[PDB]
């Protein structure tokens, strides 16, 4: 499913991402826009052979199992396909583990290069939250 901007903001708020580990909602909406264009079904293969899945592009080397990433962990204990659902619960729950790992939202390259240090509240302006 392709979310609208405010529809995803509201879904993220309901699943407890707003100010999670100090990152306001706009940071999460900006990261999803630039990682997946708000498409839950987005995938992209990396040179190391791992793949990134779903609205927040969560990687199979560490976080999920896709059966084709040798030596990977599965720290979120889920098949990577669960991250492609129209229900973002599994992606949110795994993103809370990633953001708690030490580097905060710098784990998401698009957030660090396109959202960090910008006016991220713009991403939630206008929405009924
Ligand atoms: Cl980037």
Swiss-Prot record:
Its EC number is 3.2.1.17. It comes from the Eukaryota. InterPro entries: Glyco_hydro_22, Glyco_hydro_22_CS, Glyco_hydro_22_lys, Lysozyme-like_dom_sf. It is found in: Secreted. It holds the Pfam family Lys. Belongs to the glycosyl hydrolase 22 family. Lysozymes have primarily a bacteriolytic function; those in tissues and body fluids are associated with the monocyte-macrophage system and enhance the activity of immunoagents. Has bacteriolytic activity against M.luteus. This is Lysozyme C. It comes from Gallus gallus (Chicken). The gene is LYZ.
